[PDB]
Amino acid sequence: EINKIIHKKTFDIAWGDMDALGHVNNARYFDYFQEARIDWLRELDIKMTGQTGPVVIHVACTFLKPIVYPATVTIHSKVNSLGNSSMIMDHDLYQEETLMAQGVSKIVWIDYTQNKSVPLPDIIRNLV
Amino acid sequence: EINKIIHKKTFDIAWGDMDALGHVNNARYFDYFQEARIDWLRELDIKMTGQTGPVVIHVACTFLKPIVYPATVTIHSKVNSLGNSSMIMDHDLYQEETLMAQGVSKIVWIDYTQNKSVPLPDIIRNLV
Amino acid sequence: IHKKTFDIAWGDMDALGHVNNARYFDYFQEARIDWLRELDIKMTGQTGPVVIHVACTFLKPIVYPATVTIHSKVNSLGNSSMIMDHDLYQEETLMAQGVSKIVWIDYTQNKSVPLPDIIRNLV
Amino acid sequence: HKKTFDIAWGDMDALGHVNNARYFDYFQEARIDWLRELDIKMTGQTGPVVIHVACTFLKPIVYPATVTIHSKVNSLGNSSMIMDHDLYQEETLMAQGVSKIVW
Ligand SMILES: CC(C)(COP(=O)(O)OP(=O)(O)OC[C@H]1O[C@@H](n2cnc3c(N)ncnc32)[C@H](O)[C@@H]1OP(=O)(O)O)[C@@H](O)C(=O)NCCC(=O)NCCS
Numbered sequence: 001e002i003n004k005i006i007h008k009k010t011f012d013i014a015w016g017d018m019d020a021l022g023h024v025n026n027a028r029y030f031d032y033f034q035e036a037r038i039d040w041l042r043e044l045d046i047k048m049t050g051q052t053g054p055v056v057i058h059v060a061c062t063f064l065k066p067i068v069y070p071a072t073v074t075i076h077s078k079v080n081s082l083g084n085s086s087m088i089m090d091h092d093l094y095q096e097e098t099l100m101a102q103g104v105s106k107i108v109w110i111d112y113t114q115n116k117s118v119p120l121p122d123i124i125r126n127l128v
Numbered sequence: 129e130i131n132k133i134i135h136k137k138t139f140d141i142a143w144g145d146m147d148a149l150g151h152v153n154n155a156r157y158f159d160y161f162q163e164a165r166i167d168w169l170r171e172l173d174i175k176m177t178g179q180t181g182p183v184v185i186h187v188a189c190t191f192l193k194p195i196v197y198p199a200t201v202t203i204h205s206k207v208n209s210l211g212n213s214s215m216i217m218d219h220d221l222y223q224e225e226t227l228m229a230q231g232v233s234k235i236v237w238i239d240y241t242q243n244k245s246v247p248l249p250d251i252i253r254n255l256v
Numbered sequence: 257i258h259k260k261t262f263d264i265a266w267g268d269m270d271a272l273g274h275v276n277n278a279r280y281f282d283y284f285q286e287a288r289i290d291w292l293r294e295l296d297i298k299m300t301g302q303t304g305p306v307v308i309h310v311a312c313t314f315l316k317p318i319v320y321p322a323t324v325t326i327h328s329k330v331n332s333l334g335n336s337s338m339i340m341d342h343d344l345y346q347e348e349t350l351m352a353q354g355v356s357k358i359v360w361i362d363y364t365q366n367k368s369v370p371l372p373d374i375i376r377n378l379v
Numbered sequence: 380h381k382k383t384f385d386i387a388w389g390d391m392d393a394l395g396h397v398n399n400a401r402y403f404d405y406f407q408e409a410r411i412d413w414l415r416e417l418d419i420k421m422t423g424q425t426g427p428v429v430i431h432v433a434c435t436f437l438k439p440i441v442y443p444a445t446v447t448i449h450s451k452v453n454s455l456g457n458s459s460m461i462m463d464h465d466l467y468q469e470e471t472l473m474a475q476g477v478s479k480i481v482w
């Protein structure tokens with residue numbers, strides 16, 4: 001239902017993603033989480049194009065082990081907390097078996113033009 | 129001394145920082161916080177080069193109002209709670225009088241080569 | 257005839273301790289977009305510029321910290337096209353030289369339009 | 380060398396296409412990968428340094444897109460070399476990068 005792994009994306013880190021001390025910069029993690037989230041929403045008939053859509057209100061990451069080039073990583077994604085307009089999404093970042101990072105993003109649905117929160121769509125509601 | 133404003137960075141957003149939705153992409157915020165912080169460490173005569181240095185162990189941001197090109201934004205940074213190896217830095221990012229975001233970063237001091245926790249610099253200790 | 261000065265971000269560097277080369281194109285792009293915005297040419301509108309060619313010469317590597325200056329000029333005016341130069345100096349040293357050929361087209365219509373006269377005034 | 384990959388949505392700028400610098404990121408990554416295959420790493424004291432780089436934009440790339448980069452050594456100087464990265468979407472050539480590299 002809700003807190004199950006609903007999306008798994010595997011990909012490779014670019015060497016230029018690393019900063020001057022030789023590991024992937026922290027913002028790139030949020031880029032990764034971004035692509036995984038967007039891909040899953042793509043799976044769910046939810047688009048960035050429409051008049052109304054999701055916006056990140058909060059996002060966070062816990063770094064347990066550093067990632068160095070080259071590395072093949074897997075992201076396991078689950079959605080946990082649904083408000084009326086808000087939702088929480090979790091991203092687990094693995095290198096091989098080893099778990100490298102923890103992402104948590106609070107996303108809100110809004111009318112982009114009117115920058116006001118709008119309630120959450122039914123298709124995610126169906127994950128109960 | 130501690131939760132006092134210890135760094136203030138004012139700058140203009142780059143157009144290329146915006147995503148396909150016509151406002152600044154979320155990771156770019158973490159770039160901003162990262163550079164403000166690094167400038168402050170520079171202010172404490174701390175540079176990223178030495179045998180010992182800061183490592184982000186946690187980072188988070190709350191986005192209150194969207195940012196569009198062009199915009200002049202200010203980051204106000206304070207250090208709030210100090211451990212032996214860890215510290216937290218808070219960032220308020222305003223466009224003019226309005227608050228766009230609030231960032232929280234937990235940083236740990238380590239020996240980079242050995243990947244081990246190391247105590248906080250004394251120059252950081254002076255803010256108590 | 258235009259100079260944008262700024263400070264290098266530490267995160268612009270790659271794992272080899274120098275500003276990444278693509279980041280230069282980000283810099284030049286920002287200088288160009290800035291200068292066009294100053295002349296009230298905006299990225300928002302239905303019609304706008306599209307870069308068809310861009311190039312950079314790397315003379316000296318840039319390391320954090322560095323305060324750099326970009327000097328942007330349009331050297332050659334076509335009818336629909338233009339050539340713009342962005343030279344990146346760190347104080348007395350010239351660090352990089354970028355050259356971009358730019359044409360104006362309609363994003364919606366995917367079609368050519370002649371040059372504005374105000375750009376002709378950058379001569 | 381042939382590197383195929385997929386475009387990230389965040390690679391796009393506010394105009395709905397891949398930002399121009401990211402192409403140089405792509406080319407650079409293809410180069411580094413080929414070097415990795417030939418057991419050449421930037422870690423060592425000796426390595427290639429790009430002195431010139433250029434790109435011609437022929438057709439815009441929109442998300443999603445599966446792109447193939449074909450990279451070859453074009454011209455060998457004594458210290459210099461020219462390297463080409465042609466970026467194709469399927470059969471269509473989308474961009475062409477040319478970089479002059481020395482050691
Ligand atoms: C969304 C936004 C307009 C506020 O909308 P709103 O109409 O005022 O309604 P809310 O503030 O209550 O936001 C909705 C949810 O965000 C949550 N939220 C609000 N403040 C929060 C905070 N400081 N931290 C974490 N979550 C928060 C609320 O719990 C709320 O949950 P709900 O669905 O149960 O009501 C504002 O956050 C915003 O400007 N977002 C833009 C997003 C952005 O800047 N970048 C995203 C990438 S484009």
Ligand SMILES: CC(C)(COP(=O)(O)OP(=O)(O)OC[C@H]1O[C@@H](n2cnc3c(N)ncnc32)[C@H](O)[C@@H]1OP(=O)(O)O)[C@@H](O)C(=O)NCCC(=O)NCCS
Nearest residue numbers: 024025026063064065066183184185211212213214236245
């Ligand atoms: C930072 C790091 C080396 C510490 O490793 P560790 O096994 O957690 O060692 P410790 O548990 O002793 O951590 C020590 C400090 O970090 C804190 N900490 C440890 N584990 C934590 C966790 N899971 N979550 C949040 N904080 C944690 C501790 O409170 C402690 O702070 P203190 O000195 O004030 O008491 C490790 O977490 C790591 O590899 N992080 C990613 C490295 C990196 O590249 N960061 C850059 C961002 S990309």
